Structure formats: structure tokens, C-alpha cells
Design a binder for this molecule. Structure first.
Ligand SMILES: OC[C@H]1O[C@@H](S[C@@H]2O[C@H](CO)[C@H](O)[C@H](n3cc(-c4cccc(F)c4)nn3)[C@H]2O)[C@H](O)[C@@H](n2cc(-c3cccc(F)c3)nn2)[C@H]1O
Length: 137
């Protein structure tokens, strides 16, 4: 799949929706991002960074009217340059759950609670993308 990729979500999202994203991180990667978009806003941005001041970190945030909010940062970092990944995002009523490679990673509480208007999932950064699917579980 061509990166950056925009997965259409015309139905929006809703509790019990699982999004499964598979691919391989490129060699010498710098960044990856998932953007759950609502028009011009980003309800949930999930952004692994491989070298921010010589640290690996996951940054999560929301963008409202061109302004980013308070970042939620994780040092737990399951990605490796050149290696395959499987990111899974489970939508729940109060939060997104994120798992990587079949291990729960983090939760992000909803900040923008109108899940029906999250209309696209952007998938960007330093990856080869195999697949991006959703299902109700
Ligand atoms: O919030 C999420 C956003 O972050 C800014 S960078 C942001 O800039 C701010 C400027 O004042 C602060 O410096 C902020 N910051 C750092 C720290 C800190 C705290 C502790 C340690 C430590 F070192 C550092 N605290 N605050 C930075 O994260 C990115 O551009 C943005 N973005 C990314 C992408 C993007 C596009 C395509 C692909 C891709 F992967 C990403 N498209 N938009 C998005 O990811």
C-alpha cells in the first residue's frame, strides 16, 4: 500500500471496532504516525519516534483547530528498524486500546468523544504497509 495511506472510515468508529495495521518498519526509521482524523482535527495521533534526543518514545495527542494538546508519552517501545509490526487499535467507549505484536501497549482516553465523525485513518512515516483492516469484535 502506498504510504502515506488514508484508510476510509465512512461509518466512523465505535466501541468494539478493532483496527489492524500490518507492515515492516524501514531501515534507519525516524518516525511512524497513525492519525484518526475528524475533518481537519486529529482525534488520536499515535506517533512512535525512533530518535528524539537519542531516545525512543511513543507520543500520543489530539489536534483541535490546528493546535496540539498535551502529549501523552510512553517509553515502552516495541518497534525496531527493518522489522515487521502489527499495530492493533481497539475502540472502547472511554478510550482507544493499542497493542503491538500481540502485546497491549497503551490506552488513550478519548478527548474528542463524537466517534461517528472520525472519518479516516492516516498511516504515515517510515514503513512498508501491507494491510489496514477493521472488524467488530
Ligand atoms: O504533539 C504531537 C505533535 O508533535 C509535533 S513535534 C512537538 O513540537 C512542539 C513544539 O513546541 C514541542 O517541542 C513538542 N514537545 C516535545 C517534548 C518533549 C518532552 C519530553 C522529552 C522530549 F525529548 C521532548 N515536549 N513537547 C514536540 O513533540 C509534531 O510535529 C506533530 N506531527 C508529527 C507528524 C508526522 C507526519 C508524518 C509522519 C509522521 F510520523 C509524523 N505530523 N505532525 C505531532 O507529532
Amino acid at each position: 500500500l502506498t504510504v502515506p495511506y488514508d484508510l476510509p472510515l465512512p461509518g466512523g468508529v465505535m466501541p468494539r471496532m478493532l483496527i489492524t495495521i500490518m507492515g515492516t518498519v524501514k531501515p534507519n526509521a525516524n518516525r511512524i504516525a497513525l492519525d484518526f482524523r475528524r475533518g481537519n482535527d486529529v482525534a488520536f495521533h499515535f506517533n512512535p519516534r525512533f530518535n528524539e534526543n537519542n531516545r525512543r518514545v511513543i507520543v500520543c495527542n489530539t489536534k483541535q483547530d490546528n493546535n496540539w494538546g498535551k502529549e501523552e508519552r510512553q517509553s515502552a517501545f516495541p518497534f525496531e528498524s527493518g522489522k515487521p509490526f502489527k499495530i492493533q487499535v481497539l475502540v472502547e467507549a472511554d478510550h482507544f486500546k493499542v497493542a503491538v505484536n500481540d502485546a497491549h501497549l497503551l490506552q488513550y482516553n478519548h478527548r474528542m468523544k463524537n466517534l461517528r465523525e472520525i472519518s479516516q485513518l492516516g498511516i504515515s512515516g517510515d514503513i512498508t504497509l501491507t494491510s489496514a483492516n477493521h472488524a467488530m469484535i
